[PDB]
Amino acid sequence: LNNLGVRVSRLEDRVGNVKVTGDARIRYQGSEDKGVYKANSKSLTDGRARVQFNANVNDKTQAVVRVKGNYEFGDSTKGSQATIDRAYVDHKFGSNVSAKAGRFQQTIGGGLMYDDTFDGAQLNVGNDKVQVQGAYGYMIDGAADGNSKSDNPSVSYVGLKGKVGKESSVGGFYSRLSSGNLNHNGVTVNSDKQDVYGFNADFRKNKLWAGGEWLKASNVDNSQAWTAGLGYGNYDIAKKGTWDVKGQYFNQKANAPIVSSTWDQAYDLTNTSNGYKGYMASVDYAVQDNVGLSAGYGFNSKDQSGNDLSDFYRAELNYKFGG
Amino acid sequence: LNNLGVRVSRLEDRVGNVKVTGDARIRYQGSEDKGVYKANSKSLTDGRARVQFNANVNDKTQAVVRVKGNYEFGDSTKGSQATIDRAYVDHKFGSNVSAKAGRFQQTIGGGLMYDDTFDGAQLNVGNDKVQVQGAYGYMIDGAADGNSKSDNPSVSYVGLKGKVGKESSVGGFYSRLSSGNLNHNGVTVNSDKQDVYGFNADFRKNKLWAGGEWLKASNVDNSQAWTAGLGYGNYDIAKKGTWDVKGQYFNQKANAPIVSSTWDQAYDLTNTSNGYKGYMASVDYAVQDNVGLSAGYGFNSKDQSGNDLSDFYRAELNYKFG
């Protein structure tokens, strides 16, 4: 039987701990007014390929390295340059304490304020029913792009997430942003400390979904940003024929900090100087295994003063590697 | 006993997923006149390291991601920047119909006009003897590099490839390029729509190869470009000692669209302002398994008006992974 022993010894020679997964997305975005997605035009057809190496350093720690490449269909000015999107180490300090260090993905609150790249440290204390997440670091994506280390506002975040049943989670968050340069309406302007606090609710009774979120900066006037959505579906990308539909409403005031929202609304701190207010309806359908088509139509877009904005619409296909 | 079976199953988990392959190359190019390969010099000794990830999305769809890096031997100005060279998804809608979407490699016709990166979509029909390939998108590499999306000419291509004889292949193609910016002799000029069309033949039998191709723009004077060549050998990089020799002739006129040809000629639309006409003799030899050595000598290079261009010569070593 030692023959199979040496065969599996050879097994753990030429394979190793690294598991390679990833995805590839082909997306089309557009609007009826020029400049929403690509300057001087009203349509952006682009694609992205991501390859993620997940390696186990030891039994109690693992690290992740993701190589990401974006391109636009026909854009030949520069090569589809690869960028290390995620590079972090995940320590597991037992059954209740976990930590992340490096360039990971952070979600401030329910994701309305920020869900993207974040260089720093994160500590998770989890009862498995009530969870606490505390982060310290720097934002990288969205309205926080283009800032050097001495201009990028540091984020000190503490968030609580509890469950009120099966699949239903409520939560809150409190974050402190230092003085730094943020991008409003394409202009990088400096701002003082902000104490952004908010709450979110999510309910998944049966296959019905009902979610909402409200965040506000404590000291900055006119900063209340909230969202509220309903939906029906059972969307699983790995299972064929599982669809989903949802409709949601966004209301972001003039000074509301929306750096890079987890949602797909087209107006945030970078795009607007007078807020955003309107609906968006999204649809998902897994056409094949590990292949998913998505569509979205955002309408009734308005400014805070009653002015009118541009409707938008997107449609994309996502494919996964591993399994 | 069962634990070993569970370990074998865990191995079985990570085998049908992402498969990592690739290659490396150490190449040297030179010419008898400066500026053909590198600005203000007559030689360029560089390399390349490509790593590709063939991942099966599911039993009827796979995706390919390739990371490449080009560095000159001694050029320390910039780093060996890694680029996503290929990023596409390939679908099989049955036994014959297939499709590709994303940044994939397109070969317009036989490869004399373009065989390189393509941004768009491709549809393949046909079972085993007649194959129809319809591509729609944008060229990226070659004479179409440096253009933006709004300046890049859009290619609508349909090509037919028939199998004749035991393994001979004949074919033709018709492609339409929208108005856009293209690189003529180092300057980006805006050309109108073109309707290019051509034919090719490839008769190979008993270690003897004879190939030919001819393409032409419909509404452009002196735009035809053709190649014709012979060869003898059984080259196969995965088998040691499999040599190969070949010799071929190119003649592409001043307006002939040669964006990035599949052959190793040093002159195309980017380098020549009045055409190209000359011979090239090439040799290949697999010195080891999965290792190959290639050499090439392009001579008799002349302009369409009799002006004499410069000879060129290349020597490269390609190592194939997996």
Next chain:
Amino acid sequence: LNNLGVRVSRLEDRVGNVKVTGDARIRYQGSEDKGVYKANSKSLTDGRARVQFNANVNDKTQAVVRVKGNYEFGDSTKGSQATIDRAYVDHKFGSNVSAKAGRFQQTIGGGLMYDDTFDGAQLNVGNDKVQVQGAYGYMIDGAADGNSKSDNPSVSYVGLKGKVGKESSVGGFYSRLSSGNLNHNGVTVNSDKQDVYGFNADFRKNKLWAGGEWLKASNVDNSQAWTAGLGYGNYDIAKKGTWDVKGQYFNQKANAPIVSSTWDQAYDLTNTSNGYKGYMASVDYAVQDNVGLSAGYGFNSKDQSGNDLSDFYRAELNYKFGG
């Protein structure tokens, strides 16, 4: 069992040759004076993610492709670009002669002058006792960065290394550098040919180590450089609890070619106007398997004329994969 044997054979069929390894480092560097590590600041905290593919081309040859990405915590101006750091092919013409071609790592002598990226060819000839390594190429990193081929000085190196006793090694080297540009104190200066010859010794016994290196440019005045260090420890990142400590003295003159030293001194030909002379103490400890915490404190930093320089201090975590 026979069916399981056939299954193991089938799995062995689908194994390929590419083995994915790598590492992830989170580092902090600082100095008592600004400009040593980062411009107009006295602290530089950053991170690195490297993923290495070891492909086995055939029985007597392999190739290596390394994708490396360096980022700074908070620096969002320029993305964490992925660069091909190593790309080379290794040939084995028997049990004695080996060759390398491409972009690999070269260790000129003991590593004080250079242990970093190299573009060219290398040839190793020798048995288990004596090794002779001859390399022709270009330096890419260190003080030779930022140069094109026409300015990058070609390096012709030949180094002999003989093992004395067990786990201890002595050796020497002779290297010839052509005329080219080098980054002296932030200014690219064109220098003529150099003939740098040197010796090194590395005595290891049980858990104690005594190392020394001395290199000199033959035709350049005030170009001598040397280091001498003593260490105690049994460091091995793959094993938990294996500590290590060492203390070493660097004395390198104004014209001594120190492009990219394998040590951790911050003053090498690129931020020195009058050389470097001072001590550095380093402490390593593998806190977990494949995880290692390192710290370093360089003090008594002075010029060759007696004018003092700035202290420096570093602290980093290294995570390794694959093995």
